Amino acid sequence: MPVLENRAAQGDITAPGGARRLTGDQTAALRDSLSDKPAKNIILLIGDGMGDSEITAARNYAEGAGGFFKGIDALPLTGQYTHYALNKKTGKPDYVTDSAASATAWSTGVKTYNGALGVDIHEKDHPTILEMAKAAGLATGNVSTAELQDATPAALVAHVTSRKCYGPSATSEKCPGNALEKGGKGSITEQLLNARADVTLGGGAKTFAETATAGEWQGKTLREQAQARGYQLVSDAASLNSVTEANQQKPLLGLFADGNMPVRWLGPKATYHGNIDKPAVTCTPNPQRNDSVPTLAQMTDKAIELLSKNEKGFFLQVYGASIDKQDHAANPCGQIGETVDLDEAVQRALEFAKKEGNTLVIVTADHAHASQIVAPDTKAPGLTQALNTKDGAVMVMSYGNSEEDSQEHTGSQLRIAAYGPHAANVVGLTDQTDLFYTMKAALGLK
Amino acid sequence: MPVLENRAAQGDITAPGGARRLTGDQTAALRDSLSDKPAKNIILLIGDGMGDSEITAARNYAEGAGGFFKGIDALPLTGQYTHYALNKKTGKPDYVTDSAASATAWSTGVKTYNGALGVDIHEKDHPTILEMAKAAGLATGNVSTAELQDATPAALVAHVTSRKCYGPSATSEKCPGNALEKGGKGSITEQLLNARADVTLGGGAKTFAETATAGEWQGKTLREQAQARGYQLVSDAASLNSVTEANQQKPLLGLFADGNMPVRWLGPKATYHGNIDKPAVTCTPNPQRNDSVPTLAQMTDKAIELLSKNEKGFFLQVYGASIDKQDHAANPCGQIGETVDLDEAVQRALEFAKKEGNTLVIVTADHAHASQIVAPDTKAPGLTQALNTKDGAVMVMSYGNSEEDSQEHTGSQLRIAAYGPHAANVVGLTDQTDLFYTMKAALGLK
Ligand SMILES: [Zn+2]
Ligand SMILES: [Zn+2]
Ligand SMILES: [Zn+2]
Ligand SMILES: [Zn+2]
Numbered sequence: 001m002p003v004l005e006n007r008a009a010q011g012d013i014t015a016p017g018g019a020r021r022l023t024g025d026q027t028a029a030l031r032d033s034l035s036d037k038p039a040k041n042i043i044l045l046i047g048d049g050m051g052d053s054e055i056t057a058a059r060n061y062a063e064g065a066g067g068f069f070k071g072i073d074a075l076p077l078t079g080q081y082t083h084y085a086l087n088k089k090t091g092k093p094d095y096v097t098d099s100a101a102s103a104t105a106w107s108t109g110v111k112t113y114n115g116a117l118g119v120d121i122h123e124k125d126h127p128t129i130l131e132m133a134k135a136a137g138l139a140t141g142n143v144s145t146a147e148l149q150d151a152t153p154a155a156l157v158a159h160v161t162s163r164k165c166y167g168p169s170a171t172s173e174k175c176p177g178n179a180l181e182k183g184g185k186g187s188i189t190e191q192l193l194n195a196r197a198d199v200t201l202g203g204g205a206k207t208f209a210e211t212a213t214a215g216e217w218q219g220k221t222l223r224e225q226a227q228a229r230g231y232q233l234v235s236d237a238a239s240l241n242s243v244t245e246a247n248q249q250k251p252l253l254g255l256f257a258d259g260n261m262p263v264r265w266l267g268p269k270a271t272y273h274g275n276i277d278k279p280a281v282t283c284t285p286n287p288q289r290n291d292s293v294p295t296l297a298q299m300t301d302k303a304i305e306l307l308s309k310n311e312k313g314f315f316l317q318v319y320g321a322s323i324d325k326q327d328h329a330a331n332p333c334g335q336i337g338e339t340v341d342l343d344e345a346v347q348r349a350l351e352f353a354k355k356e357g358n359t360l361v362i363v364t365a366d367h368a369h370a371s372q373i374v375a376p377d378t379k380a381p382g383l384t385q386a387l388n389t390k391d392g393a394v395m396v397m398s399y400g401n402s403e404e405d406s407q408e409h410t411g412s413q414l415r416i417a418a419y420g421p422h423a424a425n426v427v428g429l430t431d432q433t434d435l436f437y438t439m440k441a442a443l444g445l446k
Numbered sequence: 447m448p449v450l451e452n453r454a455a456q457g458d459i460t461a462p463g464g465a466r467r468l469t470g471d472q473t474a475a476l477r478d479s480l481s482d483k484p485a486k487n488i489i490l491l492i493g494d495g496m497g498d499s500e501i502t503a504a505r506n507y508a509e510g511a512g513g514f515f516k517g518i519d520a521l522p523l524t525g526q527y528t529h530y531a532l533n534k535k536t537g538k539p540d541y542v543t544d545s546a547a548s549a550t551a552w553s554t555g556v557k558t559y560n561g562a563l564g565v566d567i568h569e570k571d572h573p574t575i576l577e578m579a580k581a582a583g584l585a586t587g588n589v590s591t592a593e594l595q596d597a598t599p600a601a602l603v604a605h606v607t608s609r610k611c612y613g614p615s616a617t618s619e620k621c622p623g624n625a626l627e628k629g630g631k632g633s634i635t636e637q638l639l640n641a642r643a644d645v646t647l648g649g650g651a652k653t654f655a656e657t658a659t660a661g662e663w664q665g666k667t668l669r670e671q672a673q674a675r676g677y678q679l680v681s682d683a684a685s686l687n688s689v690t691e692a693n694q695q696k697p698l699l700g701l702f703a704d705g706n707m708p709v710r711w712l713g714p715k716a717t718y719h720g721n722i723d724k725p726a727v728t729c730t731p732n733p734q735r736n737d738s739v740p741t742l743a744q745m746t747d748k749a750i751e752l753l754s755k756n757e758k759g760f761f762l763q764v765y766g767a768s769i770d771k772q773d774h775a776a777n778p779c780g781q782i783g784e785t786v787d788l789d790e791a792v793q794r795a796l797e798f799a800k801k802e803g804n805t806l807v808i809v810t811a812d813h814a815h816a817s818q819i820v821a822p823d824t825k826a827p828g829l830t831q832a833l834n835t836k837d838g839a840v841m842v843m844s845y846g847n848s849e850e851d852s853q854e855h856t857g858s859q860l861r862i863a864a865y866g867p868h869a870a871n872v873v874g875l876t877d878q879t880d881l882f883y884t885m886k887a888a889l890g891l892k
């Protein structure tokens with residue numbers, strides 16, 4: 001099955017046919033991309049807040065308008081899906097979801113309320129695709145640039161009523177019903193340790209410094225619990241490489257930062273009348289990011305290699321958190337840089353899949369976001385910034401949906417794209433929950 | 447080849463599987479959607495400013511979040527395409543296009559600068575797909591809820607350096623090199639009369655009141671001219687319905703309004719803090735629109751009847767302008783209503799195509815727009831409004847990208863969908879110009 005080799009503009013964009021991305025008819029090549037054979041592996045890549053506009057802005061800046069993401073843009077089967085959440089009290093649609101509800105949706109197959117992790121609107125637990133994978137004998141991986149306790153990674157391993165229940169302290173106070181000392185399954189972190197995925201890599205070391213309030217590991221910090229349970233812990237890139245295997249006897253746990261992992265690019269925050277009162281911006285490397293912090297692609301690399309040892313097959317989720325976070329912060333360089341970061345991850349996934357031949361790879365976002373690409377002389381009410389793109393032309397981005405310190409999600413349907421066995425089930429209009437069922441059937445779970 | 451019968455949520459939105467839009471594997475159905483046989487006809491439907499946000503908002507309001515547009519959402523082959531224009535000076539990408547430049551792109555195959563109709567940056571004319579269709583002996587249809595002189599319909603029949611050149615008067619003044627008496631092909635309206643499509647339906651009667659300055663019909667209004675040339679003139683639903691034939695001996699010219707055609711729904715204009723300071727809004731029918739003004743679907747249906755008599759085939763463009771126009775006015779009900787207007791037209795096209803068997807139907811937009819779907823509690827700097835949706839829940843829409851009297855286009859990539867012969871060529875990432883060549887190839891033109 002072919003990945004889209006090259007869909008950059010094919011010539012002189014000012015000349016007839018110069019901006020075409022197609023070189024000929026696609027029918028045959030699409031037919032060739034459609035298999036219903038069983039998937040042995042799935043790699044699900046999530047870019048948080050990566051709506052169609054975030055992809056465009058990032059392509060525009062880093063690859064040029066007629067450029068082409070070698071990962072993100074290279075998946076043959078594309079569609080649009082809906083990620084609306086629910087009002088907890090009414091059961092009716094809540095048109096703009098948070099990470100919690102949407103991640104719960106694709107990892108569980110049931111809609112839920114903003115803030116909910118692995119539970120429906122009645123607070124009843126539902127099994128996650130990762131838990132099911134592990135039970136079928138599949139190897140499991142969970143990779144994240146956010147705190148590991150954050151909604152998206154957490155949704156695969158924890159069941160709680162609020163996403164705020166990082167550790168024992170927060171749980172006892174906000175999810176009393178989940179608190180270990182109250183007869184519940186426990187905090188997000190405690191539940192993560194129980195879930196015992198083969199590979200788990202992200203930030204969020206801070207919460208492992210808490211002590212459990214009850215259970216076999218009462219009195220001991222969550223970190224020591226992990227150690228007492230046979231987890232290999234690594235804290236940087238070098239130590240990550242030293243790892244040789246990863247399984248139920250020696251699960252891998254990577255903690256690469258206190259909270260969220262550092263972002264790659266630095267640029268000023270967008271600003272009111274920024275495009276007209278402030279110079280065009282060119283992004284730069286983040287000085288606060290040490291080489292020894294692994295990159296999403298580097299984590300994705302190591303996970304694929306460790307997980308693929310498993311003959312039955314593996315399931316892996318790759319989560320680029322800070323597109324969304326930088327979008328919230330109205331920071332275009334931060335936001336574009338993390339989109340570029342995800343694209344590298346996708347490339348590693350795509351080329352593994354391309355050689356193995358029985359791997360379904362999926363790329364999407366949890367929901368849309370604020371950033372808009374607007375005309376250079378725009379006079380907008382929100383925060384704006386002008387950027388010098390690879391094309392040698394300025395692009396203006398606008399963030400205009402919040403007066404407070406944080407720009408807001410949007411509810412627009414958005415792109416989902418796939419390559420490999422069962423990738424068809426992503427085409428046309430679908431819903432976020434269909435995704436859970438697509439993965440379930442592909443791996444032949446249950 | 448199947449049209450997506452139903453991709454609404456399949457059951458209880460609150461229960462596992464209840465929000466699924468799919469009932470099973472799509473591979474087989476998708477395989478049956480891929481044919482590379484000749485297209486006898488092509489119906490291109492354009493929603494002006496109908497980006498993914500606009501589609502989702504219309505769906506949310508009129509059909510409910512888990513609802514389904516029987517037209518818009520029912521095309522199996524989907525992808526995202528880019529519509530960047532060109533800076534006329536530098537030849538580099540201008541990241542946010544207008545109607546002129548983007549409609550020039552698909553109808554012609556070449557990128558151009560904002561405001562240009564059927565000419566490249568060098569201002570050199572290029573042939574449009576409709577002129578090419580007519581040349582190949584095919585019937586041609588050009589339908590529009592906007593003024594017929596407006597960029598999108600005009601791009602098929604006129605070549606001018608500025609979209610402003612409605613009639614001789616404005617042409618002589620702003621496109622002298624195009625002015626008839628300065629020896630040019632003439633104004634948009636004069637060129638429209640020359641082009642002589644079999645069917646031309648829209649608004650814009652005002653400009654036909656103008657008199658030509660030079661040429662064979664000097665002194666006579668373009669209305670009179672159209673008549674001397676053998677055009678059948680209709681101006682309301684009943685007269686249009688009465689028409690029995692439309693061809694090169696008797697081309698049909700429908701003029702249903704002075705300017706743009708009247709909007710379908712009425713609602714208040716969005717407002718600063720409108721979602722918090724003012725009551726949720728329910729859209730109502732426009733009490734000013736006369737029943738005798740044809741709808742987009744009514745025009746589309748009649749065009750199809752008339753055009754399908756040609757045994758070689760037909761090309762037909764159907765343009766829903768007031769989505770964009772209401773988006774500019776920050777009027778959610780206007781906007782949504784026009785999206786509903788478009789969805790009906792798409793249905794008429796889909797149902798004709800589904801039984802004719804050899805028709806390619808395409809639905810997309812020229813570019814994205816301002817309107818965003820945001821959380822009900824949002825405090826934004828721009829204009830907002832709360833809506834009572836079909837779900838009986840409230841949706842908030844935000845227009846936050848302009849301090850001027852008009853909301854702005856956005857450069858985000860956006861959905862293109864297709865059904866029928868050669869539809870494969872829409873899947874994945876493409877460019878607006880690819881659409882020219884896709885159509886061109888599907889009709890075996892040249
Ligand atoms: Zn040139
Ligand atoms: Zn998110
Ligand atoms: Zn967020
Ligand atoms: Zn229920």
Ligand SMILES: [Zn+2]
Pocket residue numbers: 494495544545770812813
């Ligand atoms: Zn437009």
Ligand SMILES: [Zn+2]
Pocket residue numbers: 495545770771774855
């Ligand atoms: Zn517009």
